[PDB]
């Protein structure tokens, strides 16, 4: 059931990275987008955000979201999560780091809830193009028409087709830890943490400790506060500094792997044939740019393939050998002459 995914649900931690277009400039958003994979057909997009969707801190849920503000995971009800493109999208499902959504064509993808007092959105430059499966360069999945073996991402989550790495988080910096006691700098730890003390003054440079204080140095701006939180693990993101140790294992299954489904494809209007002596006058009234392919059935193929968008009449020389033409997604047909 839903709770049979403890590897990603329990162990993972919402990390924060460097969104390129966080609102006005590049801030450090908790929803730093990574690995946009718009490689499907019908226009479904898989986005690997830096936030962890679905699971409340308290084991598991789905109506909740876990994002990291500060040193703590301030989890909330997911409520107004936007997934934007040239036009706003409509999300399908969300599972931990990944969120599957269906978008219209565009050149930018932006993600963001709006926690209410603050927005915390993020975008990234990445073109998204949607080629419908078939011979007709349509734009949106139509109400009716024939069906073809498309490829897309399943809405299902309980799959293990592919895995991704997840190791110990790196040494996250936090300047807010370098407080002072009016005589010397005081370090602090919230709970179970093991911070690192470093300062510019000639002193103990290593400073690995729980709650403690500097030896001699006094200038806050002349020190470093590195934080260690190895209790949880994070995704191997390219915008986060590597931990100096071992690549901790644990294969997080990819929630939405591609599958070979069946999408509804458009159906071009039927051509109006008009026979002529050894000549096939073909009246065409396309609705959207559709491929037209014809080939002679004789010894010489004599291929002809050309996209047609504006309604036009084309003619072909149908010899006694015969001719074949495939208009749109219609099944191929054949013809004679006298």
């Amino acid at each position: 059931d839903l709770d049979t995914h403890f590897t990603q649900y329990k162990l993972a931690r919402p990390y924060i990275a460097d969104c390129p277009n966080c609102g006005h400039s590049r801030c450090d958003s908790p929803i730093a987008i990574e690995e946009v994979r718009g490689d499907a057909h019908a226009g479904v997009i898989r986005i690997q955000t830096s936030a962890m969707f679905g699971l409340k801190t308290d084991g598991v849920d789905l109506a909740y979201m876990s994002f990291m503000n500060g040193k703590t995971q301030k989890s909330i009800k997911i409520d107004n999560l936007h997934v934007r493109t040239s036009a706003p999208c409509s999300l399908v499902s969300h599972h931990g780091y990944y969120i599957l959504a269906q978008c219209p064509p565009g050149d930018t993808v932006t993600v963001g809830f709006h926690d209410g007092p603050n927005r915390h959105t993020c975008t990234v430059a990445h073109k998204v193009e949607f080629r419908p499966v078939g011979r007709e360069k349509y734009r949106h999945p139509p109400e009716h028409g024939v069906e073809l073996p498309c490829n897309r991402y399943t809405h299902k989550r309980a799959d293990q087709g592919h895995y991704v790495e997840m190791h110990q988080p790196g040494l996250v910096a936090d300047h807010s830890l370098l407080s002072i006691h009016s005589a010397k700098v005081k370090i602090t730890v919230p709970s179970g943490a093991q911070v690192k003390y470093y300062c510019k003054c000639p002193d103990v440079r290593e400073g690995i400790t729980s709650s403690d204080h500097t030896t001699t140095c006094t200038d806050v701006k002349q020190c470093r506060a590195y934080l260690i939180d190895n209790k949880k693990w994070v995704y191997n993101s390219g915008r986060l500094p590597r931990g100096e140790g071992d690549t901790f294992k644990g294969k997080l299954h990819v929630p939405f792997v591609p599958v070979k489904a069946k999408c509804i494809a458009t159906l071009a209007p039927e051509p109006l044939v008009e026979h002529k002596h050894r000549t096939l006058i073909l009246h065409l009234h396309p609705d959207h740019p559709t491929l037209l392919t014809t080939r002679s059935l004789g010894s010489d193929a004599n291929p002809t393939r050309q996209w047609i968008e504006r309604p036009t009449t084309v003619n072909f020389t149908v010899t006694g050998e015969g001719l074949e033409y495939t208009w749109g997604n219609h099944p191929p047909k054949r013809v004679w002459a006298q």
Partner: antibody, heavy 125, light 108 residues
Framework: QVQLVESGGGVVQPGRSLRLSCAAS????????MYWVRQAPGKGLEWVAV????????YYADSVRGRLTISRDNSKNTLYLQMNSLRAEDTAVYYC??????????????????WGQGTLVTVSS | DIQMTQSPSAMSASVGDRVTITCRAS??????LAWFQQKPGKVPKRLIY???SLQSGVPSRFSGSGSGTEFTLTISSLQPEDFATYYC?????????FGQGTKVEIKR
């Protein structure tokens, strides 16, 4: 059974160098933090140095910093202490030790459970 | 650096006595501290860790208390095998200094 066996102790002249070794067995040596502790004749214990499972970090008491170098060879299950510029004050039994046999990258809270019998270093002319 | 101060440096006690050894850190070490017994000519043996976790296989007569800067080893009823030198160790930071050691001798 977990064993640690120190070797390479002996008599050395002041200003000379000596290399201690500690062979390990009965546990996964390459996964655990290793420590040197010394005890001068008739004195209390003195913490000398520590090295991580991978050797990537190394720490030293200020009394030995710049003169002693801790190292390891995980392929040989062997810990080393290179001692340079030895002084009469470095005359001690040197003990090889580890925490309880459970692992970590740059973390430990089981300091000093398993130890060797120690090797005597005498620094004298 | 951190320094560990033990009090007393030596004490005389009888079999059955309650022995209390105090260790003070020069800076806060939370509870990342341990206690070690050494008999003459032997290797040290750990008795307590985390300032109160009794080591597996060590007698229930040993107990530990304190946090932050002030810590203690309490032997509730001193046995003949307990006459030894006792060290505190802080393990919150590296370097990890031992205390000077407290020698428990037989009172006569």
């Amino acid at each position: 059974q977990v064993q640690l066996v120190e070797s390479g102790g002996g008599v050395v002249q002041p200003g000379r160098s000596l290399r201690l070794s500690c062979a390990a067995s009965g546990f996964t040596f390459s996964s655990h933090v290793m420590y040197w502790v010394r005890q001068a004749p008739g004195k209390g214990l003195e913490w000398v140095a520590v090295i991580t499972y991978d050797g990537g970090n190394k720490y030293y008491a200020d009394s030995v910093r710049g003169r002693l170098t801790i190292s390891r060879d995980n392929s040989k299950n062997t810990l080393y202490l290179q001692m340079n510029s030895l002084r009469a004050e470095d005359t001690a039994v040197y003990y090889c030790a580890s925490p309880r046999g459970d692992s970590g990258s740059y973390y430990d809270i089981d300091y000093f459970d398993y130890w060797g019998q120690g090797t005597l270093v005498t620094v004298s002319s | 650096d951190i320094q560990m101060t033990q009090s007393p440096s030596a004490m005389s006690a009888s079999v059955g006595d309650r022995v209390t050894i105090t260790c003070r850190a020069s800076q806060g070490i939370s509870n990342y501290l341990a206690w070690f017994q050494q008999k003459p000519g032997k290797v040290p043996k750990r008795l307590i860790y985390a300032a109160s976790s009794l080591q597996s296989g060590v007698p229930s007569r040993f107990s530990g208390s304190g946090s932050g800067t002030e810590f203690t080893l309490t032997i509730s009823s001193l046995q003949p095998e307990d006459f030894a030198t006792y060290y505190c160790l802080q393990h919150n930071t590296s370097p990890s200094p031992f205390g000077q050691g407290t020698k428990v001798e037989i009172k006569r």
